[PDB]
Structure 1
């Protein structure tokens, strides 16, 4: 297809996915369902007025003048009588209505006075506005704007806009509806349908648009469905007027008198194109992957388990470092990326910017630990490491760091986290508040969200500690001195009296809600749900293998748990989050380490591998390194270690 058509379809798909798509339904769509047209009504009026009709005398202004003459001469009763005679019948819905509703439009603007679009919503709730009083009394935030006053209240001629008198005083009689339509056009992305290029409404819209600034609005999309393909001069002239035309007869060949097929072809292409990604060459795939991944560059480390949420369940990212296709119906972009990785010659097939983007993607993916696909996987081995002084507990080093002078916002974030781990929670809250206030100048906002989460967690911890101290202060302390000031607590209570953590993510800009989708899990216990359940299941397996006396000579099933454990720790200790100070995390770490130690002890002793299977099955072994000792010391109690030593 044409490049410009592809670009227009891509923009329409993006607008629909973002929820900013509105449809301007014309009168041809209603005609498709054999609804009576206006020329039939004007012919009936002409027959009633004079006595005989004539085809020659029928222009654009005649359609608006003849009903006006009929109203002025015959009166009002006859006008509504004819309208009721020709408009009382009811007609079935059209497949085009269902196709256009399946595109998920935010609002629907129509200039019809019918109910076919109304009855098409299938199970969707839309607020109908057709009079002036209905604008204020809307029940929802989704608008079905019938501009010309449908027949809901009756069949009288005063509720519609048909004659020349109603057209002339339209702006005076209907200010709110016109203003609402204008602002809806201004904000959302609007696609016309079922309209002739010479229609009165389109010309009025173009005339109004010409008053605006050059770059203060987006160009509305138009769909043309006529038997004759559009001429070059007309297309250029209408494009220069600020309206982007998509032709239908040009794409699909059909006869003169067929109308449903062009509409259906265009709408089917629009519906199919949304889930399809138009990537064919290496440049497009690399650009798409960069667009998906680059927002994650702000964070130091990302865990592999939730990476599948970025790609919308299109690829299962195994914990060990392999990826598996799950629901990628379209092109296998991961396959192409790994093929580009495995061959250095094809790296010359991209431009310099694409080459540097590929280099950055290589750096990021190697840092996160993604290696290759399951088929290409061999005997890969992965080590672990942590780059935070807080984890290692070098307290003098962090004290010296906090003595240093701040140089940037991220450095202040690191200082705040390090100081919070130092127990000086008042200064930690003060520094977090200063960071939030000073982070107004930003381009991403991730630091703001993380600092707000940390501030809320610190407030909760302070409240819990001040409540809990009095309980044990009588016996294990005796002194009963609260290390806090009432002024600080009062200010804390006043400041956090209305901060709702549930809807903090919903209030963030749409860009943040689209890019940083995973970070939502940090607002609650959800980010611990995807791991804990797995652990439980694995436990129910391992003990089942322990009581039956079975010795598997292959890979040990506990490895997954270990990897996940370390993964979580890294993601919670390299991004400087306060969630590492909770109780659920401590319990989870204790359970994981206990299961690992029990499995290692059980597999330490063997019967047949020593004498019968000594020629193979040697890979069994459990090193206990510095990280395991740190994890045990941090997240264990005396009784738990006593139970471990007993068992």
Structure 2
């Protein structure tokens, strides 16, 4: 139970630096388990010594008298195959391997460690059933034909064959002829295995440092040059603890060993105790339960928020994806525990803030990171926890000259010299707002060259989107210029030359925005997962379906005087609108001018006004005319004027004046 936390403090510096690197690879999606016979025997599966007891007695008459020599143990199923045929070799395999045995809790812990691939030398079907119970598909590969006919790009690579194509012995490598013809019969299973090891993080489960598979894999590693490959990890589940001279010998061969008999004290036959004490020590280090240092909560919040310093504002509905749904961040600034089955690292952060002596107990590096996080959350308006919600005032502030319509200040900003690549990303958004879309497409193009040779993830990605959106904004404008805009304008032409419109067609040919985020680096796709939605053809669909809980459902609320607890439905819609405007205008995203965004402001603002009317008039006939207030309760302000003035057609303001 709580033994694992007092095991964890007894780990040395070697095992802690193994658990920190196995768990950083599971979060990156580069973790692969290499599964042996150890997890198959913990499900009662017929071991290969129970077969070799069958052959020696159907080929030598009597059962075995003495131990198997290694000369005999390798060659008994080959003597049976050569002398007693090939249908009887497959008969004995059919007699023992029709079992339908259960999956051990270790098959669940491997998959709960979220692997990208699973390689196995097990010819059983036990790992393949457990993958299909969960909501991820693995392309099972057990023959040569399955590699080119692969489907899902997450492989369950069975490098020792399988019995999916029948209980035949020609589909599973078992004999000695199948051990020496493996590179001839399986050229593509070997190359696919050696490429996953070269490109991922490998952990071996179910082996014992002398195996035919571990030794033929450490020979391949001897051929590779120094420091080009990551060293595989090796979980050792044996009764005897590892001796120090052996752990030196396998670390120089390229294995990073985590001995399970060196971490817990267990009996000689309790293999689930040893397998679960290393797997649960990885799983409960990811589901962060081994954080009891009060300055490890700083470099955990810093490692997920220091990416987001490159952006200006982050929505609070996006911060519940940064922390992997552990906390709700409500629009008041309150943090509410959701799915954190671990240590309260956000509860502790707000206990550093009100305090100061608990804060002087930090280091000389992790105290400056507290001042980076405190200057983050104060800017974004994350205030406290749920149980400290006093009298809160969340006033919206949009610091953007394009929102406020300072058109002459933007023109001076365009003429001035460009010191940064951020001061150019702001100009190209100011170019597009002023309608000089000719120069905006070119200036985004100059950012796309200069940001990919300078290790800038956001400014490259946000310029790919805004160049495509201004490409859409041009190519659907000329549709009005050839049509309605030919008789409206006196010149009967666009300011888009025939050379410019033809040039953007060569560059934007076959440019799919749907594959942009996956064509970014792996560190971009983890640190900036919150920016995936901008490339999507339709966002704001959660915000639109959550408008039915506005003036539509005032039927049961106003008929009995029902009010929403905490933040009311008026305040949640109005402050998730303000988070969308502050995210889109401060991060200079050109998707703020399109019809999907403008109709969302029309749908949400009208329904907030129609709820404030239906309620105003339900209070009049229920609780008298003089007792009901003349104001509707919907108090409009500066930011509410600008949003109605910018996003509404005049036929849409006429609808509010009637309703």
Scaled by the length of structure 2, the TM-score of the pair is 0.83
Aligned-residue RMSD, C-alpha: 4.5
Bigger CA radius of gyration: 1
Judging changes above 3 Å, is the alpha-carbon distance between structure 1 residues 598 and 232 closer, same or farther for their aligned structure 2 residues?
A: same
Measure how far apart 1:289 and its partner are.
Answer: 0.5
For the 8 Å contact 1:444–1:512, the answer to whether it is kept is no
For the 8 Å contact 1:419–1:425, the answer to whether it is kept is yes
Instruction: Deviation per CA, 1:44-71: give whole Å up to 9, x if none.
Output: 5555666677766744344235555666
Instruction: Deviation per CA, 1:543-564: give whole Å up to 9, x if none.
Output: 9989999999999975555444
3-state secondary structure, aligned to 2:144: coil
Consecutive unaligned residues of structure 1, counting only runs of 5 or more, are: none
Judging changes above 3 Å, is the alpha-carbon distance between structure 1 residues 329 and 472 closer, same or farther for their aligned structure 2 residues?
A: same
Measure how far apart 1:73 and its partner are.
Answer: 6.9
Measure how far apart 1:175 and its partner are.
Answer: 3.1
Instruction: Deviation per CA, 1:469-493: give whole Å up to 9, x if none.
Output: 3443466446533332222222223
Equivalences for 1:551-562 in 2 at 5 Å?
558-562=570-574
Alpha-carbon distance in structure 1 between the residues aligned to 2:120 and 2:488: 75
For the 8 Å contact 2:32–2:201, the answer to whether it is kept is yes
3-state secondary structure, aligned to 2:110: helix
Is the deviation greater in 134-143 or in 419-428?
134-143
For the 8 Å contact 2:558–2:615, the answer to whether it is kept is no
Instruction: Deviation per CA, 1:16-49: give whole Å up to 9, x if none.
Output: 3433332222234444444444445555555566
Instruction: Deviation per CA, 1:234-261: give whole Å up to 9, x if none.
Output: 2233233221222233444443344344
Judging changes above 3 Å, is the alpha-carbon distance between structure 1 residues 619 and 304 closer, same or farther for their aligned structure 2 residues?
A: farther
For the 8 Å contact 2:616–2:628, the answer to whether it is kept is no
3-state secondary structure, aligned to 1:324: strand
Instruction: Give the equivalent residue in structure 2 for 1:247.
Output: 259
Judging changes above 3 Å, is the alpha-carbon distance between structure 1 residues 127 and 526 closer, same or farther for their aligned structure 2 residues?
A: closer
For the 8 Å contact 1:114–1:150, the answer to whether it is kept is yes
For the 8 Å contact 1:26–1:192, the answer to whether it is kept is yes
Is the deviation greater in 329-338 or in 387-396?
387-396
> Number of matched residues?
647
3-state secondary structure, aligned to 1:551: coil
Measure how far apart 1:503 and its partner are.
Answer: 2.9
Is the deviation greater in 621-630 or in 278-287?
621-630
For the 8 Å contact 1:64–1:162, the answer to whether it is kept is no
Is the deviation greater in 545-554 or in 509-518?
545-554
3-state secondary structure, aligned to 1:607: helix
Is the deviation greater in 292-301 or in 550-559?
550-559
Of 624, 642, 648, which aligns to 1:612? 624
Judging changes above 3 Å, is the alpha-carbon distance between structure 1 residues 64 and 494 closer, same or farther for their aligned structure 2 residues?
A: same
Judging changes above 3 Å, is the alpha-carbon distance between structure 1 residues 618 and 136 closer, same or farther for their aligned structure 2 residues?
A: closer
Alpha-carbon distance in structure 1 between the residues aligned to 2:417 and 2:586: 21
Measure how far apart 1:410 and its partner are.
Answer: 1.3
Alpha-carbon distance in structure 2 between the residues aligned to 1:14 and 1:551: 45
Instruction: Give the equivalent residue in structure 2 for 1:189.
Output: 201
Is the deviation greater in 570-579 or in 476-485?
476-485
Consecutive unaligned residues of structure 2, counting only runs of 5 or more, are: 1-10
Judging changes above 3 Å, is the alpha-carbon distance between structure 1 residues 531 and 611 closer, same or farther for their aligned structure 2 residues?
A: closer
For the 8 Å contact 2:122–2:158, the answer to whether it is kept is yes
Alpha-carbon distance in structure 2 between the residues aligned to 1:547 and 1:156: 72
Measure how far apart 1:461 and its partner are.
Answer: 1.5
Alpha-carbon distance in structure 2 between the residues aligned to 1:556 and 1:356: 38
Instruction: Deviation per CA, 1:584-635: give whole Å up to 9, x if none.
Output: 4334445666677788999999999999999999999987665454444433
Alpha-carbon distance in structure 2 between the residues aligned to 1:166 and 1:548: 78
For the 8 Å contact 1:225–1:247, the answer to whether it is kept is yes
Measure how far apart 1:361 and its partner are.
Answer: 0.7
Instruction: Deviation per CA, 1:136-195: give whole Å up to 9, x if none.
Output: 444443333333344555666655544545434443443333222222222222222222
Alpha-carbon distance in structure 2 between the residues aligned to 1:583 and 1:72: 75
Alpha-carbon distance in structure 2 between the residues aligned to 1:162 and 1:438: 56
Alpha-carbon distance in structure 2 between the residues aligned to 1:89 and 1:531: 51
For the 8 Å contact 2:201–2:232, the answer to whether it is kept is yes
Is the deviation greater in 208-217 or in 584-593?
584-593
Measure how far apart 1:465 and its partner are.
Answer: 1.8
3-state secondary structure, aligned to 2:124: coil
For the 8 Å contact 1:553–1:617, the answer to whether it is kept is no
Is the deviation greater in 182-191 or in 65-74?
65-74
Alpha-carbon distance in structure 1 between the residues aligned to 2:584 and 2:425: 14
Instruction: Deviation per CA, 1:279-331: give whole Å up to 9, x if none.
Output: 22221111100111111111111222332222233222222333333333322
Instruction: Deviation per CA, 1:70-122: give whole Å up to 9, x if none.
Output: 66777778766766676677766555445545544333333344444456557
